[PDB]
Design a protein around this ligand. Sequence first.
Ligand code: NAD
Ligand code: NAD
Lengths: 264, 256
Amino acid sequence: HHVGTSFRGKNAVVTGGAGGIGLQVSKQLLAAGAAKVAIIDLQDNLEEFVKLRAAHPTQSVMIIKMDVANKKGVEATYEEIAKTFGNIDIVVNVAGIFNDKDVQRTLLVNLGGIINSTLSALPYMGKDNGGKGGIVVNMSSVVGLDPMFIIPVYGATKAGIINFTRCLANEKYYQRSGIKFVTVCPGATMTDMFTNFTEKIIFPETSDETYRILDRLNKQSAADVSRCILNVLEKDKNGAVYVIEGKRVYPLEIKPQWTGKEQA
Amino acid sequence: HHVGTSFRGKNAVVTGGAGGIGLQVSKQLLAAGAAKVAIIDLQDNLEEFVKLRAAHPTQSVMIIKMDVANKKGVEATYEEIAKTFGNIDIVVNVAGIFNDKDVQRTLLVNLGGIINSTLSALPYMGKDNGGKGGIVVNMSSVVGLDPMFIIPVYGATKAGIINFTRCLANEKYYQRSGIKFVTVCPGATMTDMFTNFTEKIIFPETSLNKQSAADVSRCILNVLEKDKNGAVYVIEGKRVYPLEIKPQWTGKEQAL
Ligand SMILES: NC(=O)c1ccc[n+]([C@@H]2O[C@H](COP(=O)([O-])OP(=O)(O)OC[C@H]3O[C@@H](n4cnc5c(N)ncnc54)[C@H](O)[C@@H]3O)[C@@H](O)[C@H]2O)c1
Ligand SMILES: NC(=O)c1ccc[n+]([C@@H]2O[C@H](COP(=O)([O-])OP(=O)(O)OC[C@H]3O[C@@H](n4cnc5c(N)ncnc54)[C@H](O)[C@@H]3O)[C@@H](O)[C@H]2O)c1
Protein backbone atom coordinates (compact mmCIF):
# COMPACT_ATOMS: atom_id res chain seq x y z
CA HIS A 1 0.00 0.00 0.00
CA HIS A 2 2.53 2.58 1.19
CA VAL A 3 3.86 5.08 -1.34
CA GLY A 4 7.37 6.41 -0.69
CA THR A 5 9.43 9.51 -1.41
CA SER A 6 12.59 8.22 -3.15
CA PHE A 7 11.34 9.29 -6.59
CA ARG A 8 8.90 12.02 -5.51
CA GLY A 9 8.02 14.42 -8.33
CA LYS A 10 9.75 12.32 -10.98
CA ASN A 11 8.26 11.54 -14.39
CA ALA A 12 9.27 8.21 -15.88
CA VAL A 13 8.90 6.35 -19.16
CA VAL A 14 9.38 2.56 -19.25
CA THR A 15 9.47 0.45 -22.42
CA GLY A 16 8.69 -3.23 -21.86
CA GLY A 17 6.76 -2.34 -18.72
CA ALA A 18 3.89 -4.81 -19.15
CA GLY A 19 5.98 -7.85 -18.23
CA GLY A 20 9.16 -9.11 -16.58
CA ILE A 21 11.69 -6.59 -15.28
CA GLY A 22 9.94 -3.63 -16.93
CA LEU A 23 6.71 -4.34 -15.09
CA GLN A 24 8.55 -4.46 -11.76
CA VAL A 25 10.46 -1.27 -12.62
CA SER A 26 7.10 0.44 -13.18
CA LYS A 27 5.63 -0.83 -9.90
CA GLN A 28 8.71 0.00 -7.84
CA LEU A 29 8.88 3.55 -9.24
CA LEU A 30 5.21 4.14 -8.39
CA ALA A 31 5.84 2.61 -4.96
CA ALA A 32 8.76 5.02 -4.54
CA GLY A 33 6.33 7.86 -5.23
CA ALA A 34 7.00 8.80 -8.84
CA ALA A 35 4.61 11.58 -9.84
CA LYS A 36 4.03 10.05 -13.28
CA VAL A 37 4.87 6.73 -14.98
CA ALA A 38 4.32 5.87 -18.64
CA ILE A 39 4.50 2.34 -20.03
CA ILE A 40 5.31 1.31 -23.60
CA ASP A 41 4.75 -2.32 -24.56
CA LEU A 42 3.27 -4.59 -27.23
CA GLN A 43 1.11 -6.65 -24.88
CA ASP A 44 -1.99 -5.41 -23.06
CA ASN A 45 -2.11 -6.21 -19.36
CA LEU A 46 -5.40 -4.63 -18.31
CA GLU A 47 -5.91 -6.75 -15.17
CA GLU A 48 -2.49 -5.71 -13.85
CA PHE A 49 -2.91 -2.06 -14.84
CA VAL A 50 -6.39 -1.68 -13.31
CA LYS A 51 -4.91 -2.77 -9.95
CA LEU A 52 -1.91 -0.52 -10.53
CA ARG A 53 -3.96 2.62 -11.16
CA ALA A 54 -6.09 1.75 -8.11
CA ALA A 55 -3.04 1.41 -5.86
CA HIS A 56 -1.70 4.75 -7.08
CA PRO A 57 -4.66 7.18 -7.36
CA THR A 58 -2.60 10.34 -6.85
CA GLN A 59 -0.02 9.24 -9.42
CA SER A 60 -0.25 9.19 -13.20
CA VAL A 61 -0.17 5.74 -14.79
CA MET A 62 -0.20 5.91 -18.58
CA ILE A 63 -0.20 2.85 -20.86
CA ILE A 64 0.50 2.86 -24.60
CA LYS A 65 0.50 -0.16 -26.91
CA MET A 66 3.42 0.29 -29.30
CA ASP A 67 6.19 -1.61 -31.07
CA VAL A 68 9.48 0.04 -30.06
CA ALA A 69 10.85 -1.03 -33.46
CA ASN A 70 8.37 1.40 -35.01
CA LYS A 71 10.36 4.64 -35.33
CA LYS A 72 7.46 7.00 -36.06
CA GLY A 73 5.14 5.23 -33.63
CA VAL A 74 7.64 5.70 -30.80
CA GLU A 75 8.09 9.35 -31.81
CA ALA A 76 4.31 9.83 -31.83
CA THR A 77 4.00 7.95 -28.54
CA TYR A 78 6.46 10.31 -26.86
CA GLU A 79 4.62 13.38 -28.16
CA GLU A 80 1.44 12.22 -26.45
CA ILE A 81 3.28 11.31 -23.23
CA ALA A 82 5.02 14.69 -23.19
CA LYS A 83 1.80 16.73 -23.52
CA THR A 84 0.38 15.03 -20.38
CA PHE A 85 3.64 14.64 -18.46
CA GLY A 86 5.21 17.95 -19.50
CA ASN A 87 8.67 16.55 -18.82
CA ILE A 88 10.58 13.27 -18.76
CA ASP A 89 13.10 12.82 -15.94
CA ILE A 90 13.69 9.08 -16.31
CA VAL A 91 13.71 6.64 -19.23
CA VAL A 92 14.31 2.95 -18.66
CA ASN A 93 14.37 1.08 -21.95
CA VAL A 94 13.73 -2.53 -20.97
CA ALA A 95 11.76 -3.86 -23.97
CA GLY A 96 13.55 -6.62 -25.88
CA ILE A 97 13.31 -10.21 -27.13
CA PHE A 98 15.31 -13.39 -27.61
CA ASN A 99 15.02 -14.93 -31.07
CA ASP A 100 18.12 -15.95 -33.05
CA LYS A 101 16.04 -17.70 -35.69
CA ASP A 102 14.60 -14.29 -36.61
CA VAL A 103 17.60 -12.01 -37.13
CA GLN A 104 15.86 -8.93 -38.58
CA ARG A 105 13.32 -8.77 -35.76
CA THR A 106 16.00 -9.14 -33.08
CA LEU A 107 18.10 -6.26 -34.46
CA LEU A 108 15.14 -3.90 -34.92
CA VAL A 109 13.49 -4.65 -31.57
CA ASN A 110 16.51 -5.06 -29.28
CA LEU A 111 18.95 -2.52 -30.73
CA GLY A 112 16.52 -0.46 -32.81
CA GLY A 113 13.99 -0.05 -30.01
CA ILE A 114 16.58 1.21 -27.53
CA ILE A 115 17.78 3.74 -30.13
CA ASN A 116 14.25 4.77 -31.14
CA SER A 117 13.13 5.31 -27.54
CA THR A 118 16.34 7.09 -26.54
CA LEU A 119 16.50 9.53 -29.47
CA SER A 120 12.76 10.17 -29.14
CA ALA A 121 13.02 11.00 -25.44
CA LEU A 122 15.80 13.59 -25.75
CA PRO A 123 13.85 16.71 -26.82
CA TYR A 124 11.50 16.39 -23.85
CA MET A 125 14.38 15.83 -21.42
CA GLY A 126 17.05 18.23 -22.63
CA LYS A 127 17.63 21.53 -20.82
CA ASP A 128 18.08 23.39 -24.12
CA ASN A 129 14.47 22.46 -24.97
CA GLY A 130 13.16 23.72 -21.63
CA GLY A 131 13.56 20.32 -19.99
CA LYS A 132 14.95 19.81 -16.50
CA GLY A 133 17.49 17.25 -17.68
CA GLY A 134 17.36 13.60 -16.67
CA ILE A 135 18.67 10.08 -17.10
CA VAL A 136 18.28 7.22 -19.60
CA VAL A 137 18.97 3.70 -18.37
CA ASN A 138 19.37 1.32 -21.31
CA MET A 139 19.01 -2.43 -20.82
CA SER A 140 21.72 -4.72 -22.16
CA SER A 141 23.24 -8.09 -21.24
CA VAL A 142 26.41 -9.62 -19.81
CA VAL A 143 26.81 -11.34 -23.18
CA GLY A 144 26.95 -7.82 -24.60
CA LEU A 145 30.24 -7.40 -22.75
CA ASP A 146 31.54 -10.96 -23.10
CA PRO A 147 30.26 -12.90 -26.15
CA MET A 148 28.26 -16.10 -25.59
CA PHE A 149 28.76 -18.54 -28.49
CA ILE A 150 25.26 -20.06 -28.30
CA ILE A 151 23.49 -16.76 -28.98
CA PRO A 152 25.56 -14.65 -31.43
CA VAL A 153 22.73 -12.51 -32.87
CA TYR A 154 21.14 -11.63 -29.53
CA GLY A 155 24.63 -10.88 -28.21
CA ALA A 156 25.49 -8.54 -31.09
CA THR A 157 22.47 -6.33 -30.31
CA LYS A 158 23.56 -6.09 -26.67
CA ALA A 159 27.10 -5.10 -27.61
CA GLY A 160 25.48 -2.49 -29.83
CA ILE A 161 23.33 -1.18 -26.98
CA ILE A 162 26.36 -0.69 -24.72
CA ASN A 163 28.42 1.10 -27.37
CA PHE A 164 25.43 3.24 -28.41
CA THR A 165 24.59 4.31 -24.84
CA ARG A 166 28.22 5.17 -24.01
CA CYS A 167 28.46 7.52 -27.02
CA LEU A 168 25.66 9.73 -25.73
CA ALA A 169 27.49 10.02 -22.38
CA ASN A 170 29.63 12.82 -23.84
CA GLU A 171 30.71 15.65 -21.52
CA LYS A 172 29.91 18.31 -24.12
CA TYR A 173 26.43 16.89 -24.69
CA TYR A 174 25.72 16.66 -20.96
CA GLN A 175 26.72 20.27 -20.34
CA ARG A 176 24.34 21.27 -23.14
CA SER A 177 21.45 18.87 -22.53
CA GLY A 178 21.72 17.85 -18.88
CA ILE A 179 20.74 14.28 -19.78
CA LYS A 180 22.80 11.37 -18.44
CA PHE A 181 23.16 7.91 -19.99
CA VAL A 182 23.64 4.60 -18.19
CA THR A 183 23.90 0.97 -19.32
CA VAL A 184 22.97 -1.99 -17.12
CA CYS A 185 23.88 -5.57 -17.98
CA PRO A 186 21.99 -8.33 -16.12
CA GLY A 187 23.49 -11.79 -15.70
CA ALA A 188 21.71 -15.03 -14.85
CA THR A 189 18.10 -13.92 -14.36
CA MET A 190 14.74 -15.66 -14.06
CA THR A 191 13.35 -14.25 -17.30
CA ASP A 192 10.48 -15.79 -19.28
CA MET A 193 12.41 -14.56 -22.33
CA PHE A 194 14.69 -17.63 -22.21
CA THR A 195 11.80 -20.11 -22.05
CA ASN A 196 11.95 -22.69 -24.87
CA PHE A 197 15.60 -21.67 -25.35
CA THR A 198 16.69 -24.43 -27.75
CA GLU A 199 13.83 -23.58 -30.11
CA LYS A 200 15.36 -20.11 -30.42
CA ILE A 201 19.00 -20.87 -31.24
CA ILE A 202 20.80 -21.16 -34.59
CA PHE A 203 23.15 -24.10 -33.96
CA PRO A 204 21.03 -27.03 -32.70
CA GLU A 205 24.06 -29.10 -31.63
CA THR A 206 24.83 -26.59 -28.88
CA SER A 207 21.94 -27.97 -26.81
CA ASP A 208 24.56 -30.19 -25.15
CA GLU A 209 26.33 -27.22 -23.55
CA THR A 210 23.31 -24.93 -23.13
CA TYR A 211 23.62 -25.32 -19.35
CA ARG A 212 25.86 -22.23 -19.13
CA ILE A 213 23.05 -19.70 -19.60
CA LEU A 214 20.12 -21.45 -17.90
CA ASP A 215 21.64 -23.36 -14.94
CA ARG A 216 21.67 -20.64 -12.28
CA LEU A 217 18.81 -18.35 -13.30
CA ASN A 218 17.20 -18.58 -9.84
CA LYS A 219 20.06 -16.41 -8.55
CA GLN A 220 18.05 -13.22 -9.21
CA SER A 221 14.46 -12.34 -10.17
CA ALA A 222 12.89 -9.49 -12.15
CA ALA A 223 12.07 -7.74 -8.87
CA ASP A 224 15.71 -8.12 -7.76
CA VAL A 225 17.02 -6.58 -10.98
CA SER A 226 14.41 -3.82 -10.73
CA ARG A 227 15.65 -2.94 -7.24
CA CYS A 228 19.16 -2.84 -8.70
CA ILE A 229 17.98 -0.50 -11.46
CA LEU A 230 16.40 1.96 -9.01
CA ASN A 231 19.61 1.75 -6.99
CA VAL A 232 21.54 2.67 -10.15
CA LEU A 233 19.07 5.48 -10.93
CA GLU A 234 19.76 7.13 -7.57
CA LYS A 235 23.51 6.93 -8.25
CA ASP A 236 23.03 9.21 -11.28
CA LYS A 237 26.52 8.47 -12.63
CA ASN A 238 26.85 9.48 -16.29
CA GLY A 239 28.40 6.96 -18.66
CA ALA A 240 28.39 4.19 -16.08
CA VAL A 241 28.06 0.53 -17.00
CA TYR A 242 26.66 -1.86 -14.39
CA VAL A 243 26.47 -5.63 -14.18
CA ILE A 244 23.55 -7.04 -12.21
CA GLU A 245 24.23 -10.55 -10.94
CA GLY A 246 23.01 -12.40 -7.86
CA LYS A 247 20.75 -9.52 -6.76
CA ARG A 248 23.73 -7.16 -6.72
CA VAL A 249 25.11 -4.16 -8.64
CA TYR A 250 28.68 -4.14 -9.94
CA PRO A 251 30.10 -1.05 -11.69
CA LEU A 252 32.64 -1.76 -14.46
CA GLU A 253 35.69 0.40 -15.14
CA ILE A 254 35.71 0.00 -18.91
CA LYS A 255 39.24 0.62 -20.21
CA PRO A 256 39.72 1.70 -23.88
CA GLN A 257 40.49 -1.17 -26.26
CA TRP A 258 42.63 0.66 -28.83
CA THR A 259 45.30 2.67 -27.02
CA GLY A 260 48.10 1.94 -29.47
CA LYS A 261 49.87 -0.56 -27.21
CA GLU A 262 49.67 -3.13 -30.02
CA GLN A 263 53.16 -4.06 -31.19
CA ALA A 264 52.92 -4.71 -34.96
CA HIS B 1 49.58 -8.23 -65.38
CA HIS B 2 51.30 -10.86 -63.23
CA VAL B 3 49.07 -13.28 -61.33
CA GLY B 4 50.54 -14.74 -58.14
CA THR B 5 50.35 -17.88 -56.02
CA SER B 6 49.61 -16.59 -52.50
CA PHE B 7 45.93 -17.54 -52.82
CA ARG B 8 46.25 -20.24 -55.51
CA GLY B 9 43.26 -22.58 -55.63
CA LYS B 10 41.18 -20.52 -53.21
CA ASN B 11 37.51 -19.64 -53.73
CA ALA B 12 36.44 -16.30 -52.31
CA VAL B 13 33.21 -14.38 -51.75
CA VAL B 14 33.33 -10.61 -51.19
CA THR B 15 30.36 -8.44 -50.22
CA GLY B 16 30.74 -4.74 -51.04
CA GLY B 17 33.24 -5.62 -53.75
CA ALA B 18 32.08 -3.08 -56.35
CA GLY B 19 33.58 -0.12 -54.51
CA GLY B 20 36.08 1.04 -51.91
CA ILE B 21 37.97 -1.54 -49.87
CA GLY B 22 35.83 -4.41 -51.16
CA LEU B 23 36.79 -3.67 -54.76
CA GLN B 24 40.49 -3.67 -53.86
CA VAL B 25 40.07 -6.88 -51.84
CA SER B 26 38.57 -8.44 -54.96
CA LYS B 27 41.39 -7.25 -57.23
CA GLN B 28 44.20 -8.21 -54.86
CA LEU B 29 42.82 -11.72 -54.36
CA LEU B 30 42.66 -12.24 -58.13
CA ALA B 31 46.16 -10.76 -58.43
CA ALA B 32 47.30 -13.26 -55.80
CA GLY B 33 45.92 -16.03 -58.01
CA ALA B 34 42.61 -16.92 -56.40
CA ALA B 35 40.95 -19.61 -58.52
CA LYS B 36 37.50 -18.04 -58.11
CA VAL B 37 36.13 -14.73 -56.78
CA ALA B 38 32.48 -13.81 -56.30
CA ILE B 39 31.31 -10.26 -55.66
CA ILE B 40 28.11 -9.21 -53.90
CA ASP B 41 27.10 -5.56 -54.17
CA LEU B 42 24.22 -3.18 -54.94
CA GLN B 43 26.13 -1.33 -57.67
CA ASP B 44 26.99 -2.81 -61.08
CA ASN B 45 30.36 -1.16 -61.94
CA LEU B 46 30.51 -2.80 -65.37
CA GLU B 47 33.55 -1.00 -66.85
CA GLU B 48 35.68 -2.11 -63.89
CA PHE B 49 34.48 -5.73 -64.04
CA VAL B 50 34.89 -6.11 -67.81
CA LYS B 51 38.50 -5.00 -67.32
CA LEU B 52 38.88 -7.34 -64.35
CA ARG B 53 37.71 -10.53 -66.11
CA ALA B 54 40.00 -9.67 -69.03
CA ALA B 55 42.98 -9.37 -66.69
CA HIS B 56 42.14 -12.77 -65.17
CA PRO B 57 41.03 -15.11 -67.99
CA THR B 58 41.99 -18.33 -66.18
CA GLN B 59 40.17 -17.24 -63.03
CA SER B 60 36.46 -17.10 -62.25
CA VAL B 61 35.03 -13.63 -61.66
CA MET B 62 31.36 -13.75 -60.68
CA ILE B 63 29.22 -10.66 -60.04
CA ILE B 64 25.82 -10.62 -58.34
CA LYS B 65 23.68 -7.56 -57.64
CA MET B 66 22.13 -8.08 -54.20
CA ASP B 67 21.20 -6.23 -50.99
CA VAL B 68 23.04 -7.93 -48.12
CA ALA B 69 20.19 -6.83 -45.86
CA ASN B 70 17.98 -9.17 -47.89
CA LYS B 71 18.11 -12.43 -45.92
CA LYS B 72 16.60 -14.74 -48.54
CA GLY B 73 18.34 -13.00 -51.43
CA VAL B 74 21.72 -13.53 -49.78
CA GLU B 75 20.78 -17.16 -49.10
CA ALA B 76 19.71 -17.59 -52.73
CA THR B 77 22.83 -15.74 -53.90
CA TYR B 78 25.10 -18.17 -52.04
CA GLU B 79 23.41 -21.25 -53.50
CA GLU B 80 24.20 -20.18 -57.08
CA ILE B 81 27.74 -19.16 -56.12
CA ALA B 82 28.16 -22.56 -54.47
CA LYS B 83 26.91 -24.40 -57.55
CA THR B 84 29.64 -22.85 -59.69
CA PHE B 85 32.39 -22.61 -57.06
CA GLY B 86 31.65 -25.97 -55.40
CA ASN B 87 33.10 -24.77 -52.10
CA ILE B 88 33.96 -21.50 -50.35
CA ASP B 89 37.34 -21.04 -48.70
CA ILE B 90 37.20 -17.29 -48.00
CA VAL B 91 34.47 -14.79 -47.13
CA VAL B 92 35.25 -11.11 -46.63
CA ASN B 93 32.14 -9.17 -45.65
CA VAL B 94 32.98 -5.56 -46.46
CA ALA B 95 29.60 -4.13 -47.52
CA GLY B 96 28.32 -1.36 -45.25
CA ILE B 97 27.07 2.23 -45.11
CA PHE B 98 27.17 5.39 -43.03
CA ASN B 99 23.80 7.02 -42.37
CA ASP B 100 22.83 7.95 -38.81
CA LYS B 101 19.71 9.82 -39.94
CA ASP B 102 18.42 6.46 -41.21
CA VAL B 103 18.67 4.08 -38.24
CA GLN B 104 16.74 1.05 -39.55
CA ARG B 105 18.74 0.92 -42.79
CA THR B 106 22.04 1.20 -40.88
CA LEU B 107 21.23 -1.72 -38.56
CA LEU B 108 19.96 -4.00 -41.34
CA VAL B 109 22.77 -3.25 -43.81
CA ASN B 110 25.77 -2.92 -41.49
CA LEU B 111 25.00 -5.50 -38.80
CA GLY B 112 22.31 -7.50 -40.60
CA GLY B 113 24.30 -7.91 -43.79
CA ILE B 114 27.34 -9.26 -41.96
CA ILE B 115 25.10 -11.77 -40.12
CA ASN B 116 23.18 -12.70 -43.29
CA SER B 117 26.32 -13.26 -45.38
CA THR B 118 28.11 -15.14 -42.59
CA LEU B 119 25.30 -17.57 -41.67
CA SER B 120 24.59 -18.14 -45.38
CA ALA B 121 28.20 -19.02 -46.16
CA LEU B 122 28.61 -21.65 -43.45
CA PRO B 123 27.01 -24.73 -45.09
CA TYR B 124 29.24 -24.39 -48.14
CA MET B 125 32.35 -23.93 -45.98
CA GLY B 126 31.89 -26.38 -43.11
CA LYS B 127 33.76 -29.71 -43.04
CA ASP B 128 30.75 -31.57 -41.61
CA ASN B 129 28.80 -30.46 -44.69
CA GLY B 130 31.46 -31.89 -47.01
CA GLY B 131 33.30 -28.57 -47.20
CA LYS B 132 37.04 -28.03 -46.82
CA GLY B 133 36.67 -25.46 -44.05
CA GLY B 134 37.72 -21.83 -44.37
CA ILE B 135 37.78 -18.33 -42.93
CA VAL B 136 35.35 -15.42 -42.63
CA VAL B 137 36.78 -11.92 -42.26
CA ASN B 138 34.13 -9.49 -41.06
CA MET B 139 34.53 -5.73 -41.42
CA SER B 140 34.07 -3.51 -38.39
CA SER B 141 35.45 -0.20 -37.13
CA VAL B 142 37.69 1.25 -34.43
CA VAL B 143 34.58 3.01 -33.12
CA GLY B 144 33.17 -0.49 -32.70
CA LEU B 145 35.83 -1.00 -30.03
CA ASP B 146 35.91 2.51 -28.61
CA PRO B 147 32.63 4.46 -28.97
CA MET B 148 32.68 7.69 -30.98
CA PHE B 149 30.17 10.26 -29.75
CA ILE B 150 29.52 11.87 -33.16
CA ILE B 151 28.30 8.60 -34.74
CA PRO B 152 26.43 6.49 -32.12
CA VAL B 153 24.17 4.42 -34.42
CA TYR B 154 26.90 3.50 -36.90
CA GLY B 155 29.12 2.67 -33.92
CA ALA B 156 26.55 0.37 -32.32
CA THR B 157 26.43 -1.80 -35.46
CA LYS B 158 30.21 -2.13 -35.44
CA ALA B 159 30.27 -3.18 -31.78
CA GLY B 160 27.60 -5.68 -32.77
CA ILE B 161 29.75 -7.02 -35.61
CA ILE B 162 32.75 -7.61 -33.31
CA ASN B 163 30.74 -9.41 -30.63
CA PHE B 164 28.89 -11.48 -33.26
CA THR B 165 32.08 -12.58 -35.04
CA ARG B 166 33.87 -13.48 -31.80
CA CYS B 167 31.02 -15.79 -30.74
CA LEU B 168 31.43 -17.99 -33.82
CA ALA B 169 35.14 -18.29 -33.03
CA ASN B 170 34.34 -20.99 -30.48
CA GLU B 171 36.71 -23.97 -30.39
CA LYS B 172 33.76 -26.39 -30.32
CA TYR B 173 32.44 -24.70 -33.46
CA TYR B 174 35.87 -24.94 -35.11
CA GLN B 175 36.53 -28.65 -34.50
CA ARG B 176 33.06 -29.38 -35.88
CA SER B 177 33.11 -27.00 -38.88
CA GLY B 178 36.75 -26.10 -39.55
CA ILE B 179 35.69 -22.52 -40.25
CA LYS B 180 37.59 -19.66 -38.62
CA PHE B 181 36.26 -16.18 -37.83
CA VAL B 182 38.22 -12.92 -37.80
CA THR B 183 37.28 -9.27 -37.19
CA VAL B 184 39.21 -6.32 -38.61
CA CYS B 185 38.71 -2.75 -37.39
CA PRO B 186 40.04 0.00 -39.69
CA GLY B 187 40.89 3.44 -38.30
CA ALA B 188 41.35 6.69 -40.20
CA THR B 189 40.82 5.64 -43.84
CA MET B 190 40.27 7.46 -47.13
CA THR B 191 36.72 6.18 -47.67
CA ASP B 192 34.07 7.78 -49.88
CA MET B 193 31.59 6.55 -47.25
CA PHE B 194 32.39 9.51 -44.98
CA THR B 195 31.84 12.11 -47.72
CA ASN B 196 29.20 14.71 -46.76
CA PHE B 197 29.70 13.55 -43.16
CA THR B 198 27.78 16.33 -41.40
CA GLU B 199 24.70 15.63 -43.53
CA LYS B 200 24.67 12.12 -42.07
CA ILE B 201 24.91 12.80 -38.32
CA ILE B 202 22.19 13.11 -35.68
CA PHE B 203 23.50 16.03 -33.59
CA PRO B 204 24.19 18.80 -36.15
CA GLU B 205 26.07 21.32 -33.95
CA THR B 206 28.94 18.97 -33.07
CA SER B 207 32.42 19.59 -34.49
CA LEU B 208 42.79 10.37 -42.65
CA ASN B 209 45.25 10.42 -45.57
CA LYS B 210 47.58 7.88 -43.89
CA GLN B 211 45.83 4.84 -45.42
CA SER B 212 43.74 4.05 -48.50
CA ALA B 213 41.37 1.23 -49.47
CA ALA B 214 44.26 -0.53 -51.23
CA ASP B 215 46.34 -0.21 -48.04
CA VAL B 216 43.56 -1.71 -45.91
CA SER B 217 43.04 -4.43 -48.52
CA ARG B 218 46.71 -5.40 -48.33
CA CYS B 219 46.27 -5.57 -44.56
CA ILE B 220 43.23 -7.83 -44.96
CA LEU B 221 45.10 -10.30 -47.18
CA ASN B 222 47.89 -10.17 -44.60
CA VAL B 223 45.36 -11.08 -41.91
CA LEU B 224 43.93 -13.84 -44.14
CA GLU B 225 47.32 -15.54 -44.40
CA LYS B 226 47.69 -15.37 -40.60
CA ASP B 227 44.61 -17.60 -40.31
CA LYS B 228 44.25 -16.97 -36.56
CA ASN B 229 40.76 -17.86 -35.28
CA GLY B 230 38.98 -15.33 -33.08
CA ALA B 231 41.51 -12.61 -33.81
CA VAL B 232 40.63 -8.91 -33.80
CA TYR B 233 42.81 -6.56 -35.85
CA VAL B 234 43.04 -2.78 -36.00
CA ILE B 235 44.17 -1.35 -39.33
CA GLU B 236 45.69 2.12 -38.98
CA GLY B 237 48.33 3.91 -41.05
CA LYS B 238 48.76 1.04 -43.55
CA ARG B 239 49.54 -1.28 -40.65
CA VAL B 240 47.96 -4.27 -38.87
CA TYR B 241 47.61 -4.33 -35.08
CA PRO B 242 46.37 -7.45 -33.23
CA LEU B 243 44.39 -6.71 -30.05
CA GLU B 244 44.59 -8.58 -26.77
CA ILE B 245 40.87 -8.38 -25.85
CA LYS B 246 40.64 -8.88 -22.11
CA PRO B 247 37.25 -9.79 -20.53
CA GLN B 248 35.15 -6.86 -19.29
CA TRP B 249 33.56 -8.75 -16.40
CA THR B 250 36.00 -9.90 -13.73
CA GLY B 251 35.38 -10.96 -10.12
CA LYS B 252 37.53 -8.05 -8.95
CA GLU B 253 34.51 -5.74 -9.25
CA GLN B 254 33.27 -4.39 -5.92
CA ALA B 255 29.49 -4.33 -5.42
CA LEU B 256 27.99 -0.86 -4.91
N1 NAD C 1 21.40 -13.00 -19.34
C1 NAD C 1 20.83 -11.92 -20.15
O1 NAD C 1 21.37 -11.61 -21.20
C2 NAD C 1 19.53 -11.19 -19.70
C3 NAD C 1 18.76 -11.72 -18.69
C4 NAD C 1 17.62 -11.08 -18.29
C5 NAD C 1 17.23 -9.90 -18.91
N2 NAD C 1 18.00 -9.37 -19.92
C6 NAD C 1 17.58 -8.13 -20.56
O2 NAD C 1 16.31 -7.55 -19.76
C7 NAD C 1 15.43 -7.15 -20.65
C8 NAD C 1 14.01 -7.49 -20.19
O3 NAD C 1 13.79 -8.85 -20.33
P1 NAD C 1 12.74 -9.55 -19.32
O4 NAD C 1 13.50 -10.22 -18.18
O5 NAD C 1 11.81 -8.48 -18.76
O6 NAD C 1 11.90 -10.65 -20.12
P2 NAD C 1 10.41 -10.44 -20.66
O7 NAD C 1 10.23 -11.24 -21.91
O8 NAD C 1 9.43 -10.90 -19.61
O9 NAD C 1 10.16 -8.86 -20.96
C9 NAD C 1 9.90 -8.47 -22.32
C10 NAD C 1 8.85 -7.28 -22.34
O10 NAD C 1 9.12 -6.45 -23.32
C11 NAD C 1 7.84 -6.42 -24.30
N3 NAD C 1 8.27 -6.31 -25.68
C12 NAD C 1 8.95 -7.20 -26.45
N4 NAD C 1 9.12 -6.66 -27.68
C13 NAD C 1 8.54 -5.43 -27.68
C14 NAD C 1 8.42 -4.47 -28.65
N5 NAD C 1 8.91 -4.53 -29.98
N6 NAD C 1 7.78 -3.31 -28.39
C15 NAD C 1 7.25 -3.09 -27.16
N7 NAD C 1 7.37 -4.05 -26.18
C16 NAD C 1 8.01 -5.22 -26.44
C17 NAD C 1 7.24 -7.53 -24.12
O11 NAD C 1 5.76 -7.39 -24.41
C18 NAD C 1 7.48 -7.84 -22.60
O12 NAD C 1 6.55 -7.22 -21.83
C19 NAD C 1 15.73 -7.91 -21.90
O13 NAD C 1 15.59 -7.08 -22.97
C20 NAD C 1 17.23 -8.34 -21.77
O14 NAD C 1 18.02 -7.50 -22.68
C21 NAD C 1 19.14 -10.01 -20.32
N1 NAD D 1 36.64 4.44 -39.19
C1 NAD D 1 35.62 3.52 -39.71
O1 NAD D 1 34.62 3.31 -39.05
C2 NAD D 1 35.77 2.84 -41.11
C3 NAD D 1 36.68 3.33 -42.02
C4 NAD D 1 36.81 2.75 -43.25
C5 NAD D 1 36.02 1.66 -43.60
N2 NAD D 1 35.10 1.17 -42.69
C6 NAD D 1 34.27 0.04 -43.05
O2 NAD D 1 34.78 -0.58 -44.44
C7 NAD D 1 33.73 -1.08 -45.06
C8 NAD D 1 33.68 -0.63 -46.52
O3 NAD D 1 33.53 0.75 -46.60
P1 NAD D 1 34.33 1.51 -47.78
O4 NAD D 1 35.59 2.17 -47.21
O5 NAD D 1 34.75 0.50 -48.84
O6 NAD D 1 33.38 2.62 -48.42
P2 NAD D 1 32.52 2.39 -49.75
O7 NAD D 1 31.24 3.15 -49.64
O8 NAD D 1 33.30 2.87 -50.93
O9 NAD D 1 32.22 0.80 -49.90
C9 NAD D 1 30.90 0.31 -49.57
C10 NAD D 1 30.51 -0.82 -50.60
O10 NAD D 1 29.57 -1.58 -50.09
C11 NAD D 1 28.33 -1.59 -51.13
N3 NAD D 1 27.08 -1.65 -50.39
C12 NAD D 1 26.52 -0.71 -49.58
N4 NAD D 1 25.36 -1.22 -49.12
C13 NAD D 1 25.20 -2.46 -49.63
C14 NAD D 1 24.20 -3.40 -49.47
N5 NAD D 1 23.03 -3.27 -48.69
N6 NAD D 1 24.29 -4.58 -50.11
C15 NAD D 1 25.36 -4.86 -50.90
N7 NAD D 1 26.35 -3.92 -51.06
C16 NAD D 1 26.27 -2.73 -50.42
C17 NAD D 1 28.40 -0.49 -51.76
O11 NAD D 1 27.82 -0.63 -53.16
C18 NAD D 1 29.93 -0.19 -51.84
O12 NAD D 1 30.48 -0.76 -52.95
C19 NAD D 1 32.52 -0.57 -44.34
O13 NAD D 1 31.87 -1.59 -43.73
C20 NAD D 1 33.07 0.41 -43.26
O14 NAD D 1 32.24 0.29 -42.06
C21 NAD D 1 34.98 1.76 -41.46
